[PDB]
Amino acid sequence: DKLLVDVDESTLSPEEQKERKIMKLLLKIKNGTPPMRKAALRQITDKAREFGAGPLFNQILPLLMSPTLEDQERHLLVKVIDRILYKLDDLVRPYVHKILVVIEPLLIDEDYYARVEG
């Protein structure tokens, strides 16, 4: 919802909130043309440690909890969560239990590739 209104970046003095804003590039990852997807994915992989775990997961996991998740969207989000996991190495220690609480269902599901991913 935040992305609907607009406000200047400096006025977004909570520069972590600036971070959140620009993080909602997630939407571009979710819906968007293949080039949007690629560029966004590179963006996030390399700005990962710059962003930090807290924001990233606090704004990812709600998505994965969506009842209205389709297939593509899901496998996309797991792609990203994987790539950022490969950058943030330790910083996840506070966030493990959250990560499991969401990934676990992939362990028991009729899709094959979903099982192997999770």
Partner: protein
Amino acid sequence: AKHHPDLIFCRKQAGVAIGRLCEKCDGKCVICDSYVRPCTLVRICDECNYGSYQGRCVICGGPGVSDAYYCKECTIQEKDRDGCPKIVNLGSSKTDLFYERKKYG
């Protein structure tokens, strides 16, 4: 292989069980990823030949149809001594192509 650097090999001790490739992938070397001069046979790790995986395409994961060989180069530089080349990660490519399939049709 030399083409997707995100891929991994088993890298345990080789054994005595020969390796086999799908009809799809067949005709190539596993590492130098060429298509020529097969010299010597592949051998795979005990685990990587356990279970249902008796006779599977090392790369494609599918049905064993033929034997898997080593190019003259790889056997000249002795890249053929690193144990199971069994790829223990499926890789993004198969997943994503199947997913886009299920989407489209």
